[PDB]
Amino acid sequence: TGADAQTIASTVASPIEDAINGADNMIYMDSTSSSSGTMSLTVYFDIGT
Amino acid sequence: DPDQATIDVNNRISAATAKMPDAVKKLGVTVRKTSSTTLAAISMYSSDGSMSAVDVYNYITLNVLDELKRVPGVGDANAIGNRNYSLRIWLKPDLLNKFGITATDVISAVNDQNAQYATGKIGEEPVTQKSPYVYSITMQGRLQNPSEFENIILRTNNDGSFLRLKDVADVEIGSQQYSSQGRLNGNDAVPIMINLQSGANALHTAELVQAKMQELSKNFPKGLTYKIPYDTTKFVIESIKEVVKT
Amino acid sequence: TGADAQTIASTVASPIEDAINGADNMIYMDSTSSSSGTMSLTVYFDIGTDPDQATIDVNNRISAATAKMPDAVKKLGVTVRKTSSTTLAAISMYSSDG
Amino acid sequence: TLFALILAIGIVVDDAIIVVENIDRILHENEQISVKDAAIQAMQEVSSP
Amino acid sequence: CIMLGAIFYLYKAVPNSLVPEEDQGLMISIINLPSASALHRTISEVDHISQEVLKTNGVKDAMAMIGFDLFTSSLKENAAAMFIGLQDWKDRNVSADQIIAELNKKFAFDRNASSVFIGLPPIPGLSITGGFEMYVQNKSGKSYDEIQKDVNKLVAAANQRKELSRVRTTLDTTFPQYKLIIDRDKLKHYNLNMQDVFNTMNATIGTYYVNDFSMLGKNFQVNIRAKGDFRNTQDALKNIFVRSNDGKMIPLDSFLTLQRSSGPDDVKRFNLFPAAQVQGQPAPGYTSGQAIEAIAQVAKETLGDDYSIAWSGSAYQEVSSKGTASYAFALGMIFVFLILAAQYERWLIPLAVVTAVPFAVFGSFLLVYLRGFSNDIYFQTGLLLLIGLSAKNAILIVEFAMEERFKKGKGVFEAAVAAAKLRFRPIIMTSLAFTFGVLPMIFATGAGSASRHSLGTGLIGGMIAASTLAIFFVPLFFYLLENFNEWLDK
Amino acid sequence: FNTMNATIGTYYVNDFSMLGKNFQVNIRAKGDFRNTQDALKNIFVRSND
Amino acid sequence: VISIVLVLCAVFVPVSFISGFVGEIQRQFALTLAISVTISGFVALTLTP
Amino acid sequence: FVEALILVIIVMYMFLKNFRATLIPMIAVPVSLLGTFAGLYVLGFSINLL
């Protein structure tokens, strides 16, 4: 809370996304970041895991 | 599956650590896989009377109990009572007020004079003046024996002398807690309760327990003996022999 | 960050007293506390163990052993990493003369 | 499982003795036939049961 | 039967080994400047050693990790490890055996910085292909300056005689340090708190991490630290101040009088207790298994009533358990005998097929004796293939001998000869199509030649003696056992 | 709160080491009171004055 | 030929029952040869003739 | 593999004399080894040094 919408995706989502990438049976992921302080990152996996 | 169910509970504790009080977060909610019953119960005592009872608890929390937690299959091996010795500070409200010292003065003085902090190294790298060697810095900030704790000085008097902690309190290595004791046929004995996993082989693991206890028995001091009078698997062994007979 | 290796030896004694876990898993473990500022605690598990199972098991317990840690370490970070994976290839990166 | 094995002692020999007994019937009713051929005539009778 | 005794001596007189080392273009160097030392002086020596290793005609590329000691897995500034890559065997004219014997002789007996050159093992499981890796614990909890004085009783005597020749320990409390001595009377007489004086010391002659800042997306640390020139001195603590409670600034030279001392740089805890790592390897002739049984015996003698002779590394995987290598071969033979007894319809006939196996192990253990090899596991691998092939041909031989004696009606003598006459053509043409097939392994020129030079030298001599020495005796045992079987009719 | 928890109850404070393992330092007033109302007479805490 | 497969697998499979560090290497060789003997043995009495 | 396959070609022509006889092992050895790969795959193994 209290951060810009862009600073959340830059300082909170990036060390998370860069660390989750390379996971097993992962297809793609997206993270929405709002000025309300919320960072919602959903990681999608391959069908049948 | 014990593990599929375990890492399914985990994916609900971290999922619901948001609707959580902040004070329980810091100490951490712990999830583990262990049976709700007790597999066995070991008892250790002094066969003569020199080891007493609270001292035997320490021999367990130093040599015995740590090895019992690692034999294959056991889920938990807690010694009841928490009677391992702590460094107890016994304040006296009389002498605390004879010297105008509230208990908070002893709290910060002990918390500050007993802790250990980071120091650093001497002459590492962002240097232009050449350094031949490089040295580490040992610290030694904790206090080992109770005498050093008595000298925790709460107040510095203007006449050079200091108001030490012993002048308002008593220091002794006693016990983390004496809320419980233990008996074995009337003798002062320390109880150790051994748990089983969520789906291990009670016959297998409980036999490895007695085998490990026999290994640690070779290093017992003086008249320190042990007996395991409660074992829910010995009935299984004695009932297996009956079927071979049948 | 700082600390004589004797002090780091008293911040590894908390995960050491914590990484005593495993239903069908652990054999032994060795920690090396260094004056260089780091401590590497290597836990070996019994052969024939799912490395993902061994990783999630040892990692689940440290989340409860962090309350007794100094603040200079909780601030920096404690990391677990499976090391039974086969090492493929290594790469060296440098700038020649430039 | 150990209860079923003691239970099996009295059923495992059910088929064995139910054929050996029929060999004795043929022998006490046929002085001519030989033992090796009597076992042949036995399995002719007590195989369906 | 005399040949059977020749196999007992052939087996007892060959070196019992495990796997053989081979020339895979790879080199490692453990550079160790004297203890403590400095980083820049290690750099001055790393770029000096990485220059003369490129001088050899069989070296291709090199790279080093300055400031990380592999002897301890820690990043000590006085050491470095170097990773060297050799040229391809099509270009290099020498192997790594004499290159190491040249380099570890040129450097390790000269420079002030010790540099031992070794090579990576072929299989990552073993720790030193022949030696051990054991830890010695202490439940009683004693000072490191005394446990150092106890491990010396073990290592110095383990190298005296007995069965080992290079028993090492990695515990060293004789590492230089600066022990700060506190004066609690002064620190509080000066009206100071200890959280303050050590928080300001971590910001001057130590690294202090305050917070992070934004740049290029990533958030990096910021660290307060005195300039290096006012920290490299012996007593740089003389110009660091702390704000007192009263308001005055107080020098740390009053109560923090620094002094030299000795203590371990890397403290290691193995299984909850302080422990020391012991590494080594046996003498030229001693086997690995008994060498692990050597330190165990001598450690029960020169230790105390609180030191657990714990085990780790590969020496623990061998100590863990026993009693399995036999009850698998035994049931294998029982299943072999029954599989054949159901085929030949006789009990005393499958023994003829079994007798044609000692020929394969005699010819296989003979060629590895003349060439001077050791029965590793790549050689015993082909020994399995030869028993499976020798016994295969022997099955068909006794099969046609049973067919000739009982279907065609020929006599035992005339059938034992007519059967070997039938099987002679295929046995030879398989051997010529197989001995010639795995013949390129004898003169193998490339990587992984440790296996093929022992695999080929094993199953080439085995194939010769299992299809020229063996094909004469399979009929004899049929002649002996079948005649004895017809005797039993009486 | 820390005064009552270090006189009537037991206080946590930092730990100490001996013989190997790390044990606790625990603070509690040795002044034992059969009752309780007299305890609050003698336990003090200085204010912001 | 059928007895060859039942007797060559009788010497390849048993050496796969040693759980030692050396035995786990030899399990690779043995079971590979056991697959070869069985598969090439099946091809021997079906595809070859 | 191809060397032992060619040695089979030579041994088959030397001991039987007809090229039609050397063509048959040229189909057994490929299919047998090829099928052995399917065995090593489904059973669980993988292609490695050993």
Residue numbers in the entry:
A (entry chain C): 51 to 99
B (entry chain A): 100 to 345
C (entry chain B): 51 to 148
D (entry chain A): 396 to 444
E (entry chain B): 544 to 1033
F (entry chain A): 741 to 789
G (entry chain B): 445 to 493
H (entry chain B): 346 to 395
Give the exact sentences the study uses for this entry:
The Cme locus consists of three tandemly linked genes (cmeABC) encoding protein components of the tripartite Cme efflux pump (CmeA, CmeB, and CmeC), where all three components are absolutely required for substrate expulsion. This tripartite system is composed of the CmeB efflux pump, an inner membrane resistance-nodulation-cell division (RND)12 transport protein that contains substrate-binding sites and transduces the electrochemical energy required for pumping drugs out of the cell; the CmeA periplasmic protein, a member of the membrane fusion protein family; and the CmeC outer membrane-associated protein that is integral to the outer membrane. To understand the transport mechanism of the CmeB efflux pump from C. jejuni, we here define the X-ray structures of this membrane protein, which assembles as a trimer. Overall, CmeB adopts the fold of a typical hydrophobe-amphiphile efflux (HAE)-RND-type protein and forms a homotrimer, with its pseudo threefold symmetrical axis positioning perpendicular to the membrane surface. Each subunit of CmeB contains 12 transmembrane helices (TM1-TM12) and a large periplasmic domain created by two extracellular loops between TM1 and TM2, and between TM7 and TM8, respectively.
Two distinct conformations of CmeB with space groups C2 (form I) and P1 (form II) were captured in two different forms of crystals. Surprisingly, in the form II structure, the periplasmic cleft of one of the protomers is open, albeit similar to the conformation of the “binding” state of AcrB. We labeled this conformer as the “binding” form of CmeB. However, the periplasmic clefts of the other two protomers are closed in conformation. One of these two CmeB molecules is more related to the structure of the “extrusion” conformers of the form I structure. Thus, this conformer was classified as the “extrusion” form. Interestingly, the other CmeB molecule of the form II structure displays a distinct conformation, forming a new state that is different from the “extrusion” form. No channel was found in this conformer. This conformation probably represents one of the intermediates that the CmeB pump must go through during the transport cycle. We thus designated this conformation as the “resting” state of the CmeB efflux pump.
